[PDB]
Design a protein around this motif. Structure first.
Motif, PDB file in Angstrom:
ATOM      1  N   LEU A  14       0.823  -1.199   0.000  1.00  0.00           N
ATOM      2  CA  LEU A  14       0.000   0.000   0.000  1.00  0.00           C
ATOM      3  C   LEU A  14       0.865   1.259   0.000  1.00  0.00           C
ATOM      4  CD1 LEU A  14      -2.925   0.675  -0.214  1.00  0.00           C
ATOM      5  CD2 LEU A  14      -3.149   0.468   2.281  1.00  0.00           C
ATOM      6  N   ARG A  15       1.900   1.293   0.845  1.00  0.00           N
ATOM      7  CA  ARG A  15       2.811   2.430   0.822  1.00  0.00           C
ATOM      8  C   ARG A  15       3.413   2.614  -0.567  1.00  0.00           C
ATOM      9  NH1 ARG A  15       5.879   0.632   4.231  1.00  0.00           N
ATOM     10  NH2 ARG A  15       7.571  -0.189   2.906  1.00  0.00           N
ATOM     11  N   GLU A  16       3.763   1.508  -1.231  1.00  0.00           N
ATOM     12  CA  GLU A  16       4.344   1.602  -2.565  1.00  0.00           C
ATOM     13  C   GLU A  16       3.351   2.187  -3.560  1.00  0.00           C
ATOM     14  OE1 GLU A  16       7.144   1.124  -3.916  1.00  0.00           O
ATOM     15  OE2 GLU A  16       6.853   0.537  -6.024  1.00  0.00           O
ATOM     16  N   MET A  17       2.084   1.755  -3.498  1.00  0.00           N
ATOM     17  CA  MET A  17       1.082   2.279  -4.426  1.00  0.00           C
ATOM     18  C   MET A  17       0.790   3.752  -4.164  1.00  0.00           C
ATOM     19  SD  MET A  17      -1.594  -0.881  -4.395  1.00  0.00           S
ATOM     20  CE  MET A  17      -2.411  -0.371  -5.874  1.00  0.00           C
ATOM     21  N   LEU A  18       0.891   4.187  -2.911  1.00  0.00           N
ATOM     22  CA  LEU A  18       0.627   5.584  -2.604  1.00  0.00           C
ATOM     23  C   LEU A  18       1.851   6.445  -2.820  1.00  0.00           C
ATOM     24  CD1 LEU A  18      -1.240   4.935   0.636  1.00  0.00           C
ATOM     25  CD2 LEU A  18      -2.337   5.991  -1.369  1.00  0.00           C
ATOM     26  N   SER A  19       2.975   5.841  -3.189  1.00  0.00           N
ATOM     27  CA  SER A  19       4.201   6.603  -3.165  1.00  0.00           C
ATOM     28  C   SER A  19       4.290   7.501  -4.386  1.00  0.00           C
ATOM     29  CB  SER A  19       5.432   5.693  -3.073  1.00  0.00           C
ATOM     30  OG  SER A  19       5.680   4.981  -4.263  1.00  0.00           O
ATOM     31  N   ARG A  58      -7.573   3.050   5.365  1.00  0.00           N
ATOM     32  CA  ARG A  58      -8.334   3.170   6.597  1.00  0.00           C
ATOM     33  C   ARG A  58      -8.618   1.799   7.191  1.00  0.00           C
ATOM     34  NH1 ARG A  58     -12.958   2.499   7.580  1.00  0.00           N
ATOM     35  NH2 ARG A  58     -13.902   2.702   5.487  1.00  0.00           N
ATOM     36  N   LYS A  59      -9.013   0.830   6.345  1.00  0.00           N
ATOM     37  CA  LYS A  59      -9.342  -0.510   6.830  1.00  0.00           C
ATOM     38  C   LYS A  59      -8.110  -1.252   7.325  1.00  0.00           C
ATOM     39  CE  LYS A  59     -12.614  -2.951   4.487  1.00  0.00           C
ATOM     40  NZ  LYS A  59     -13.298  -3.497   3.283  1.00  0.00           N
ATOM     41  N   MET A  60      -6.982  -1.085   6.642  1.00  0.00           N
ATOM     42  CA  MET A  60      -5.741  -1.708   7.087  1.00  0.00           C
ATOM     43  C   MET A  60      -5.271  -1.142   8.433  1.00  0.00           C
ATOM     44  SD  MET A  60      -3.574  -3.909   5.711  1.00  0.00           S
ATOM     45  CE  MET A  60      -2.450  -3.747   4.355  1.00  0.00           C
ATOM     46  N   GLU A  64      -8.959  -4.060  10.017  1.00  0.00           N
ATOM     47  CA  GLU A  64     -10.221  -4.610   9.524  1.00  0.00           C
ATOM     48  C   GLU A  64     -10.047  -5.774   8.545  1.00  0.00           C
ATOM     49  OE1 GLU A  64     -13.333  -1.926   8.314  1.00  0.00           O
ATOM     50  OE2 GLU A  64     -12.513  -0.303   9.588  1.00  0.00           O
ATOM     51  N   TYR A  65      -8.845  -5.985   7.995  1.00  0.00           N
ATOM     52  CA  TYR A  65      -8.737  -7.163   7.144  1.00  0.00           C
ATOM     53  C   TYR A  65      -8.320  -8.345   7.997  1.00  0.00           C
ATOM     54  CZ  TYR A  65      -8.936  -3.863   3.338  1.00  0.00           C
ATOM     55  OH  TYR A  65      -9.315  -2.844   2.489  1.00  0.00           O
ATOM     56  N   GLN A  69      -5.657 -12.018   2.105  1.00  0.00           N
ATOM     57  CA  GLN A  69      -6.569 -12.216   0.987  1.00  0.00           C
ATOM     58  C   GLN A  69      -7.673 -11.177   0.975  1.00  0.00           C
ATOM     59  OE1 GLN A  69      -4.641 -14.643   1.793  1.00  0.00           O
ATOM     60  NE2 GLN A  69      -4.048 -15.248  -0.304  1.00  0.00           N
ATOM     61  N   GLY A  70      -8.129 -10.742   2.150  1.00  0.00           N
ATOM     62  CA  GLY A  70      -9.160  -9.723   2.180  1.00  0.00           C
ATOM     63  C   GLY A  70      -8.661  -8.401   1.636  1.00  0.00           C
TER      64      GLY A  70
END
Ligand SMILES: CCOc1cc(C(=O)N2CCC(N3CCN(C)CC3)CC2)ccc1Nc1ncc2c(n1)N(C1CCCC1)c1ccccc1C(=O)N2C
Length: 111
Positions: A14-19, A58-60, A64-65, A69-70
């Motif tokens: 996620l950090r990579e995708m937001l980077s 937010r969910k991570m 919340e996962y 897989q979720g």
């Protein structure tokens, strides 16, 4: 438990995708689709479960996962919404595909 080990590795995806490296094509997925500001009177008829990187974050951050897989299901849902709603020749579709290339590659390389 190796269940939260994988989820911590997914925080890195996620950090990579937001980077800042990927921002030329990732920015449409930073925040939820504002159908009213974009005048997409159609969007919530077709997209019954919207998703975006900030909601995934937010969910991570809220644990919340239940497993990796979720998380992967939500990221892919975000991509599937974009492929479903838009005509395949639109360039939000090319942008989504470039970002999914990042996601699928880094997800597969999870130890
Ligand atoms: C938080 C700000 O939000 C947005 C702001 C503005 C905006 O007014 N200015 C004006 C000029 C823009 N330009 C023109 C185009 N150029 C490729 C870049 C520079 C820059 C910003 C536009 C779209 C936004 N936000 C969005 N969020 C999800 C989606 C989304 N746009 N796109 C568009 C992103 C670019 C092309 C498609 C969609 C549009 C219609 C239907 C679906 C979708 C869709 O699937 N996604 C995921």
């Amino acid at each position: 438990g190796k269940l939260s080990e994988h989820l911590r590795y997914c925080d890195s995806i996620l950090r990579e995708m937001l980077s800042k490296k990927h921002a030329a094509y990732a920015w449409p997925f930073y925040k939820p689709v504002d159908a009213e500001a974009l005048e997409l009177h159609d969007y919530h008829d077709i997209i019954k479960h919207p998703m975006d990187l900030s909601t995934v974050k937010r969910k991570m951050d809220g644990r919340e996962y239940p497993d990796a897989q979720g998380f992967a299901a939500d990221v892919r849902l975000m991509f599937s919404n974009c492929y479903k709603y838009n005509p395949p020749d639109h360039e939000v579709v090319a942008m989504a595909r470039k970002l999914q290339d990042v996601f699928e590659m880094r997800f597969a390389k999870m130890p």
